[PDB]
């Protein structure tokens, strides 16, 4: 069946108050990001929230000399942003939904996501979250190269720049063949 | 600089009423291992705890073997004196605990990430078993260009035959350096 | 549909005036693996001819084995029938030919993709030796989800004390199954 | 020591006549590509050369198409048969993808990676981004890039920058300011 991979929807990430704040173009696909996964959850498929997760002062992470303080692990900077929030709560106990700490942009590095997701025969990944042009970049490069089929949940993903979440959509369409999709998970032409 | 591999010293692998376990010949490495471990931390070596994690019906162990290692469980606590040492220096940023799912401690964790940023070239591996765990965690570690040490007298093995062709294999194979509990090369 | 693994089955593996023979034990496989290789390639099955290449100061066995298997030598051609095989259907879309620096078949190699690219779920070793490239091209094969079918008849080792651990590793320890040169489980 | 990637600097990628072409940014980047390359090279660095291959329309096949353009061309006459010097066959965009390119680098206790050629935002960035995830230091040599349009080249150039915190050079490999 498939997968769908949420990353990095969280305060830190989204909310005005966020440490490393996308800000309002985050705040935008809230609806449509929580609709999407509560359907993807209903039609069967499995569910992989891929969280950003850092330790006060990480001198060997190669972000600690680029961006300030953010996603704390045991602060409620990790907690994800809107509905999808509420989700979490009322759904992560199930067994097809995952919390998956990751330290690399993309959400194949140094996680077991490619073991879980070929354990369960996947050959699809709906890619959601933020942000358009990094993390979920650098996870449909690494999805491209591991041979998934590749669909984007296009009202889904964002972007702190709207011209990096253009170039990121183009990439993924005309690079890696990926299938671009809307909040009900119809392809868009 | 250097790494230590603390390789599935848990209750379940080790203790008598262990769910899983190897019973006497993991038992007898418990002075050796913990030794070995204290004295890499006081070296100023990183100390990776690669610990096996069980919850699911999708795991390739579940055809296999018996309920072990679950998470939350005692079972998945380290045994003897290297159980004390987690207490003791757990909290440290040079020590880790890593869950993992398969033999090997590269499979599917971010360890090869951890000591890249480190440029750690040498690891030093102990813990159980010889000829699984150990074993899938030194040839993972040979492909990924890392030099290999194993603690002979701290690492054990069901079958002694099992110990022998895995020693063997390091050494002949996988060119890795033998040493013991004070981490000098055997002859 | 599924994929067959030709692990190293060259001249100065197998031969008698090899660089680095297995020597009586290796020869003896001589008609299984080629029937075998047949069948699967008449069923439709992939077939990957994965073979050790020489040419290099930093590579890991330079230290610990002769010189073997040197580029554009006649050691690195397949012996016995299986040469032939290669030579009459080495130019089909579904026979591949590629080139390995470490004991393992997916260490360096676009192995691990050509298969996922072909929707392949379950891989069929054969070769040599049983315990080292085997053995690692399994436990690869293990850590990257694949379904593992190991021909007895096809595999062999210097010695059979290690024939035997590496046939009990993939049995018990990594869940493959054992087929004959018939490609049926053995029971 | 440090290791240069030269990405996909080929006939089809660069000429006129060949295939897939990038066109006129693609061969005016030929005198930087070709001097930081000879530069590397003399400083004692490891130079690898990863070039598509196959077997979009048809280009870089196994062909004239696969030949290095320029000067590059001249460098890989003198020196392709040293032992610093390598050809590398990919079939993904990134250079690390199915290759033994990783394997090579930690064999020879590669820290950093110095990246060079066609195209920015595509080859480039994939391998990029896998170096990223493979912890090395990047060095991207700015004049000895290029992509076949300006504004897919400075979102690859601010993404090195400003997510991988790779340093950008010049092509005497001084760092860009
Ligand atoms: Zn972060
Ligand atoms: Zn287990
Ligand atoms: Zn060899
Ligand atoms: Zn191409």
């Known amino acids: 069946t498939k997968a769908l991979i949420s990353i990095d929807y969280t305060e ?3 909310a005005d108050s966020g440490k490393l704040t996308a800000g309002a173009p985050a705040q935008a696909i ?3 990001i929580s609709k999407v996964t509560r359907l993807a959850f209903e039609r069967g498929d499995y569910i992989f929230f891929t969280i950003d997760a850092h330790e ?3 001198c060997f ?3 600690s000399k680029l961006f ?3 996603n704390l692990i045991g602060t409620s900077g990790r907690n994800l942003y809107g509905d999808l929030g509420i989700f979490y709560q009322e759904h992560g106990s199930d067994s097809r939904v995952f919390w998956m700490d990751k330290r690399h942009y993309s959400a194949f590095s140094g996680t077991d996501l490619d073991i ?6 996947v050959s699809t990944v709906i890619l959601t979250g933020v942000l358009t042009d990094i ?3 650098h996870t449909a490069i690494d999805a491209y190269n591991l041979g998934y089929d590749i669909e984007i949940v296009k009202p889904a993903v964002a972007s702190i720049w709207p011209e990096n979440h253009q170039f990121a959509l183009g990439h993924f369409k005309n690079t890696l063949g990926a299938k671009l999709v809307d ?3 119809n392809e868009l032409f």
């Open 68 to 70: 300030p303080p953010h």
């Open 12 to 14: 830190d990430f989204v």
């Open 56 to 58: 006060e002062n990480d």
């Open 61 to 63: 992470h190669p972000e």
């Open 116 to 121: 879980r997701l070929r354990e369960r025969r």
């Open 183 to 185: 909040e009900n998970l």
């Open 135 to 137: 993390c979920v970049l």
């Open 30 to 32: 809230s609806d449509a």
